[PDB]
């Protein structure tokens, strides 16, 4: 099946930033024709550690910006919702509605997303065991979702640290397509001052592990200049490095593919 | 005074709340050194299964809780799950509770603080004790004056929670601390036998109050059936923690 | 039953240090007559993180020093062994033979201790679940041990951190007397540079929790001047604070005792 | 060359070692790009139960291993549990293995280093990746020249281990890194279905070798029966990791 690559700047810092990243993603989509690219960006960071951190410019602005990306580049779109009422307006532009990790058990949010008819991607909560995502998929199916994804983004491992238990990939594949979040998985929750920390040096090696184990897609946040990002400045991948990373995972996926176990 | 938040996990019926409210009212009259707060959820918005009991809705819930407050004169507390619910709930709830999974949702916290009511935040199973400082700050920014942080366990491997008692003195630096005696022993995805021993630990360490879900017939409860405390055992546990607190309080560290 | 208090300097820095601490422990044993005091000190720190850290002055010197303490003060003695051959010589002075946490599964070490006829205290490994200590007690009984203790000293919680799951106390009590290690439970494994870290501010509160939950004794390392200790300088309790801590736990134990559940 | 350490968990008999040694010898001739090392323990010194299989003793063990080395010309590796065992084991063992629970026992490490043989230390389930730097230093101080660190999982809650692949690049800073594919999926106090996928992960990330326990009839093994790899599946897995390594190696980060 076609491999999915969900990528984009963490937050919608401005419509200009989006178009700049979208342009590169469009270029890569023309090169890597065997990949289905989905542009991602959050119109709101509703769970920042600090009240002083950047959140966004509002739902209205964000949807408008994402719509511009889809219009100008013909790219599929995905963004996350935080309360049930946002599902309807967001579904107007989003091809895939994303459910935040902390909210993966909020029944009404899941139901709100499912009834839009759009695909739904649920970030696996840091508190959830792999086998407990079965009921998450069940809720979505109950709500009408026909295209469901589960995203591995790390599990709570002691304080301010996450570990990726790759056994989750084959387990979750039993009931949904699986995506590996290469950037949030290496972040150190509340690691820094009133902000999240992260170790970019592990992004690439862990993504290689994900494709070797076997997944249906990868999720990566990318920014022209990560150091200047308003969110996840420590983990967002430099846009110039995206091409090489994608090429590498396609190569590893190809050679490992014949060994992927049947679920 | 020492805070004791208790009541049935979910508002299974106005009838159930009244029966429990009566016992809590009696204990309230027997223990003047304690401030009792009646708790019950109008909606279990985060159940694991879509086929599990959620409740009868916000209106039916706020109505039943109002009946408890008016009939017994007890303070009330219930949890909210989305921002719009803060206002209507604040009509009856003296303390607005923020669910553990939602402790980082800025709009929910701000919505609760705006009501002018006290706010009790369940510490997420993914949060470190020191990470709660930011939670309190959000609430203060939102205008909250009476703020509580509730210890309810931390993710420890899969389908298990551990209570790191170091969290009590750490969180006390920025808020009043409550120990959730029933959810802390629950196995996500629990053991009633550990409820009492851990609550004894909490008061020996030092906290500002305890949270306990209680039900007349726990095994018949529509939620947390394996962990809700039988109503008849509530008095004994309260007396026990008051006695332990009386002796141990001499050693509670300053700030 | 008589409450057990195992205390002493972490390592046998010198025979003089031992006698100084022993003198205070003897004084407290005369005051707290309802407590059974056991003097503890390691003749060897065989598991230091760094090859450059203090280990000790040898088994011969240590046993001689411990014997002096028992002779001069009439105090019971306990020390830990690291290899089977040490059980015999150590049993000549030790009333309780201690089994290190990392070695709680080494069958021959356990058997070596059991056949000496002495009491055996096993530190629960940081990797062991409470219910898995049942087989540890089984091995000891198989080897002839008639007086067995299991010591709670924390469990691996993420990297360089330990958490105390107090549910372990009532669980382990099902098959052995339980001791709470108040000082090692708050140490941060490899936290510092080539050494262990620790948070002394949590020693007292956690010990209060242990007695409130219910245990058969407490283990505390104490030193005249912790800051100068050659091992566990961050967690050893100042000797001057021992009296107050013991008084406090006896008071909390008394008031909580009527509520201790029957196993 | 890439290292592949394989063999039956325990020396159940000289007979068993020979049968496994034959297959490993064959693979050794088929894969010249790989250095095979035959492994088997003469004693399971840390079994959970006193009634479980330990072995036939050190002498019988060193004897059987010597037979494998002489008959097939394969390098040998076995683990030691107490200092005195280093010398006699070094007579046949090319690489002396240090058990995970004993990775901090200074005298065992020094005893192994003194033999002049290579030393492979299983990373304790309680150790952080960076904590292994000190382990290597002890060995260097003891005179060790060829040093390996083996990833075999980290304590994750109770009766479960997780493999934090970040450990591979971290440990590589001070030693050659080996990934233990069979013990990493074991549930202390395991799932064979996860052995292959995680070994693929290990080579994609980048390691210097893999460790795998294999047995003709795993379900009949006297130890690690639930995790030992069936002998017949060994060739396929090796070919697979060589292919993945060939492609992925282009991206292994420097130092
Ligand atoms: Zn992000
Ligand atoms: Zn409940
Ligand atoms: Zn010590
Ligand atoms: Zn094995």
PDB file of N, CA and C in Angstrom, chain D residues 42 58 62 65-66 69 76 78 80 84-96 111-118:
ATOM      1  N   UNK D  42      26.680 -22.392  31.468  1.00  0.00           N
ATOM      2  CA  UNK D  42      26.942 -23.616  32.215  1.00  0.00           C
ATOM      3  C   UNK D  42      26.115 -23.621  33.498  1.00  0.00           C
ATOM      4  N   UNK D  58      30.039 -26.177  36.270  1.00  0.00           N
ATOM      5  CA  UNK D  58      31.046 -25.497  35.473  1.00  0.00           C
ATOM      6  C   UNK D  58      31.965 -26.430  34.685  1.00  0.00           C
ATOM      7  N   UNK D  62      32.290 -26.284  30.740  1.00  0.00           N
ATOM      8  CA  UNK D  62      33.503 -25.884  30.037  1.00  0.00           C
ATOM      9  C   UNK D  62      33.960 -27.003  29.108  1.00  0.00           C
ATOM     10  N   UNK D  65      31.615 -27.017  25.961  1.00  0.00           N
ATOM     11  CA  UNK D  65      31.938 -25.861  25.131  1.00  0.00           C
ATOM     12  C   UNK D  65      33.252 -26.080  24.399  1.00  0.00           C
ATOM     13  N   UNK D  66      34.213 -26.694  25.080  1.00  0.00           N
ATOM     14  CA  UNK D  66      35.505 -26.966  24.470  1.00  0.00           C
ATOM     15  C   UNK D  66      35.293 -27.916  23.294  1.00  0.00           C
ATOM     16  N   UNK D  69      34.087 -25.860  20.322  1.00  0.00           N
ATOM     17  CA  UNK D  69      35.161 -25.085  19.721  1.00  0.00           C
ATOM     18  C   UNK D  69      36.130 -25.958  18.927  1.00  0.00           C
ATOM     19  N   UNK D  76      33.809 -19.066  21.421  1.00  0.00           N
ATOM     20  CA  UNK D  76      32.889 -19.394  22.503  1.00  0.00           C
ATOM     21  C   UNK D  76      32.666 -18.246  23.479  1.00  0.00           C
ATOM     22  N   UNK D  78      30.379 -17.577  27.342  1.00  0.00           N
ATOM     23  CA  UNK D  78      29.490 -18.063  28.381  1.00  0.00           C
ATOM     24  C   UNK D  78      29.580 -17.028  29.492  1.00  0.00           C
ATOM     25  N   UNK D  80      29.733 -15.727  33.606  1.00  0.00           N
ATOM     26  CA  UNK D  80      30.256 -16.110  34.911  1.00  0.00           C
ATOM     27  C   UNK D  80      29.401 -15.428  35.970  1.00  0.00           C
ATOM     28  N   UNK D  84      35.789 -16.183  41.099  1.00  0.00           N
ATOM     29  CA  UNK D  84      36.649 -17.350  40.915  1.00  0.00           C
ATOM     30  C   UNK D  84      36.425 -18.098  39.600  1.00  0.00           C
ATOM     31  N   UNK D  85      35.244 -17.937  39.009  1.00  0.00           N
ATOM     32  CA  UNK D  85      34.924 -18.631  37.767  1.00  0.00           C
ATOM     33  C   UNK D  85      35.599 -18.064  36.517  1.00  0.00           C
ATOM     34  N   UNK D  86      36.035 -16.812  36.577  1.00  0.00           N
ATOM     35  CA  UNK D  86      36.661 -16.173  35.423  1.00  0.00           C
ATOM     36  C   UNK D  86      37.831 -16.950  34.832  1.00  0.00           C
ATOM     37  N   UNK D  87      38.792 -17.315  35.676  1.00  0.00           N
ATOM     38  CA  UNK D  87      39.982 -18.032  35.219  1.00  0.00           C
ATOM     39  C   UNK D  87      39.684 -19.340  34.483  1.00  0.00           C
ATOM     40  N   UNK D  88      38.989 -20.289  35.133  1.00  0.00           N
ATOM     41  CA  UNK D  88      38.693 -21.553  34.446  1.00  0.00           C
ATOM     42  C   UNK D  88      37.866 -21.401  33.169  1.00  0.00           C
ATOM     43  N   UNK D  89      36.918 -20.468  33.175  1.00  0.00           N
ATOM     44  CA  UNK D  89      36.079 -20.236  32.002  1.00  0.00           C
ATOM     45  C   UNK D  89      36.891 -19.641  30.849  1.00  0.00           C
ATOM     46  N   UNK D  90      37.826 -18.760  31.183  1.00  0.00           N
ATOM     47  CA  UNK D  90      38.668 -18.114  30.186  1.00  0.00           C
ATOM     48  C   UNK D  90      39.492 -19.118  29.373  1.00  0.00           C
ATOM     49  N   UNK D  91      39.585 -20.349  29.865  1.00  0.00           N
ATOM     50  CA  UNK D  91      40.343 -21.397  29.180  1.00  0.00           C
ATOM     51  C   UNK D  91      39.697 -21.741  27.840  1.00  0.00           C
ATOM     52  N   UNK D  92      38.373 -21.630  27.780  1.00  0.00           N
ATOM     53  CA  UNK D  92      37.636 -21.952  26.564  1.00  0.00           C
ATOM     54  C   UNK D  92      36.870 -20.765  25.983  1.00  0.00           C
ATOM     55  N   UNK D  93      36.349 -19.910  26.854  1.00  0.00           N
ATOM     56  CA  UNK D  93      35.574 -18.757  26.408  1.00  0.00           C
ATOM     57  C   UNK D  93      36.408 -17.646  25.786  1.00  0.00           C
ATOM     58  N   UNK D  94      36.064 -17.283  24.556  1.00  0.00           N
ATOM     59  CA  UNK D  94      36.748 -16.208  23.848  1.00  0.00           C
ATOM     60  C   UNK D  94      36.230 -14.873  24.377  1.00  0.00           C
ATOM     61  N   UNK D  95      34.954 -14.859  24.749  1.00  0.00           N
ATOM     62  CA  UNK D  95      34.318 -13.665  25.300  1.00  0.00           C
ATOM     63  C   UNK D  95      33.635 -14.061  26.601  1.00  0.00           C
ATOM     64  N   UNK D  96      33.989 -13.391  27.691  1.00  0.00           N
ATOM     65  CA  UNK D  96      33.376 -13.687  28.980  1.00  0.00           C
ATOM     66  C   UNK D  96      32.169 -12.771  29.141  1.00  0.00           C
ATOM     67  N   UNK D 111      37.697  -9.439  37.539  1.00  0.00           N
ATOM     68  CA  UNK D 111      38.115 -10.828  37.379  1.00  0.00           C
ATOM     69  C   UNK D 111      38.041 -11.234  35.908  1.00  0.00           C
ATOM     70  N   UNK D 112      37.004 -10.777  35.211  1.00  0.00           N
ATOM     71  CA  UNK D 112      36.843 -11.101  33.795  1.00  0.00           C
ATOM     72  C   UNK D 112      37.920 -10.406  32.960  1.00  0.00           C
ATOM     73  N   UNK D 113      38.167  -9.137  33.258  1.00  0.00           N
ATOM     74  CA  UNK D 113      39.165  -8.363  32.531  1.00  0.00           C
ATOM     75  C   UNK D 113      40.574  -8.928  32.698  1.00  0.00           C
ATOM     76  N   UNK D 114      40.871  -9.435  33.889  1.00  0.00           N
ATOM     77  CA  UNK D 114      42.187  -9.994  34.186  1.00  0.00           C
ATOM     78  C   UNK D 114      42.569 -11.191  33.311  1.00  0.00           C
ATOM     79  N   UNK D 115      41.572 -11.947  32.857  1.00  0.00           N
ATOM     80  CA  UNK D 115      41.818 -13.125  32.026  1.00  0.00           C
ATOM     81  C   UNK D 115      42.408 -12.790  30.659  1.00  0.00           C
ATOM     82  N   UNK D 116      42.278 -11.535  30.241  1.00  0.00           N
ATOM     83  CA  UNK D 116      42.797 -11.127  28.948  1.00  0.00           C
ATOM     84  C   UNK D 116      41.800 -11.348  27.823  1.00  0.00           C
ATOM     85  N   UNK D 117      40.689 -12.010  28.139  1.00  0.00           N
ATOM     86  CA  UNK D 117      39.643 -12.290  27.159  1.00  0.00           C
ATOM     87  C   UNK D 117      38.776 -11.065  26.921  1.00  0.00           C
ATOM     88  N   UNK D 118      37.935 -11.132  25.894  1.00  0.00           N
ATOM     89  CA  UNK D 118      37.026 -10.032  25.604  1.00  0.00           C
ATOM     90  C   UNK D 118      35.911 -10.153  26.638  1.00  0.00           C
TER      91      UNK D 118
END
